[PDB]
Design a protein around this ligand. Structure first.
Ligand SMILES: CCCCCCCCCCCCC/C=C/[C@@H](O)[C@H](CO[C@@H]1O[C@H](COS(=O)(=O)O)[C@H](O)[C@H](OS(=O)(=O)O)[C@H]1O)NC(=O)CCCCCCCCCCC
Ligand SMILES: CCCCCCCCCCCCC/C=C/[C@@H](O)[C@H](CO[C@@H]1O[C@H](COS(=O)(=O)O)[C@H](O)[C@H](OS(=O)(=O)O)[C@H]1O)NC(=O)CCCCCCCCCCC
Lengths: 206, 206
């Protein structure tokens, strides 16, 4: 988050793949900021999506210059297999990870907390799950997630972690997150919109 | 499993890194044979270890010809950071994955089953966990694992999956697993032994 930020969207509202991936590839360290091995495989899972995208991009950076480029090339290339293939499926899942991240931090900067347990971040994690991922998952993965929330940190530890290196007050640092959240939220919206427009979203549970 | 098998160990009992990685890189598809998204991030997690190993090997295949080569080069290179770095830490975790796999299939070929639920494989998965991974994990990851067992298949489905492509009777196919299990078990033993000998094992919980 914080330091290497995604720049804002333009007229055409196209997101360049190169810059996008350079950007998002900083976000899995962050799972280290949850501060537990419980969360290792999740990060792996997102490195995964990203790699799969970078794989396609690199086969021909011009041909796949923008994120739409990918979706539209793959639609042609693969049959009715699409969108359930390729980078389109990777970005499809990744955008949901980014969105979770997005809702989560939003929730934390906004001061949504549980009155009882106010330095836990389970409420902030659950709201995230519910907006970003729940509908695509069966009960088991939800049970798991709830159980993972016990390995989540207290809020204040989480933020030291996010800011680790920088020597700012917690208050100062939340402020850095809000600014991050501006073009992050913007960008996720643009991808979500695209997926709806190109008709690449899958609405059913894995 | 089955088709691309690791060849047996020699006099020196050294395991060549190239052949080893070519071998093991077939094993994550297998998690697809559990037949659920619950298990996706695990496979990612093992692709991970493997990648990290292949990364080092490729920087100089001769210098890291054998698996011991790696452990011993890294010991010198890194400080008292070692063995908690590098490929040594990757192979350290990977060998535990391979061992889980190893105990699991053993257990299934041997006909260890729960008398009540005899076509479930939870008992076979739990024995595995307990021998291979439990001691290195805290209660949460165990809860999770138990909960993942509900997304595990019935035994007979699992085996169709493992053999998918081949058109053999279940009985015939278990027989293919037993033979696989010969040099697989042998090889994991040789790595476990090495790690003890070079003093690279970490016995405490992540
Ligand atoms: C012994 C140790 C433990 C034992 C086993 C327990 C393992 C449980 C693991 C946790 C629960 C699973 C959660 C993840 C489920 C994933 O299946 C989903 C969907 O992931 C996609 O699956 C897809 C399946 O494909 S399809 O069938 O063709 O549609 C794809 O293969 C896709 O791969 S790709 O090639 O496109 O690149 C892949 O990302 N993963 C996610 O939902 C990612 C969510 C991001 C995590 C957000 C952060 C969570 C933080 C939690 C805080 C409490
Ligand atoms: C919303 C979706 C879900 C939300 C979040 C829930 C996520 C729960 C995920 C399942 C539970 C976690 C199980 C895995 C825990 C891992 O931490 C452990 C240890 O993994 C190692 O961690 C290490 C931590 O490093 S250390 O702190 O410096 O020591 C390393 O980073 C290492 O990376 S490497 O660079 O060396 O390559 C890494 O493999 N993973 C394992 O134990 C792997 C086990 C293999 C799985 C075997 C198959 C299970 C099948 C289950 C069937 C029921």
């Amino acid at each position: 988050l914080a330091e290497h930020l995604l720049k804002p969207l333009p007229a055409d509202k196209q997101i360049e793949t190169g810059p996008f991936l350079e950007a998002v590839s900083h976000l899995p360290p962050f799972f280290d900021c949850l501060g537990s091995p419980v969360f290792t495989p999740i990060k792996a899972v997102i490195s995964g999506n990203i790699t799969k995208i970078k794989a396609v991009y690199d086969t021909n950076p011009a041909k796949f210059r923008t994120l739409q480029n990918i979706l539209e090339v793959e639609k042609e290339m693969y049959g009715a297999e699409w969108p359930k293939v390729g980078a389109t499926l990777a970005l499809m899942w990744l955008k949901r990870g980014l969105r979770f991240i997005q809702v989560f931090l939003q929730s934390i900067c906004d001061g949504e907390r549980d009155e009882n347990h106010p330095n836990l971040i389970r409420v902030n994690a659950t709201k995230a799950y519910e907006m970003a991922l729940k509908k695509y998952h069966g009960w088991i993965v939800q049970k798991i997630f709830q159980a993972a929330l016990y390995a989540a940190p207290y809020k204040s530890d989480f933020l030291k972690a996010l800011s680790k290196g920088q020597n700012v007050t917690e208050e100062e640092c939340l402020e850095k997150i809000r600014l991050f959240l501006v073009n992050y939220t913007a960008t996720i919206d643009v991808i979500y919109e695209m997926y709806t427009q190109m008709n690449a979203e899958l609405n059913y549970k894995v």
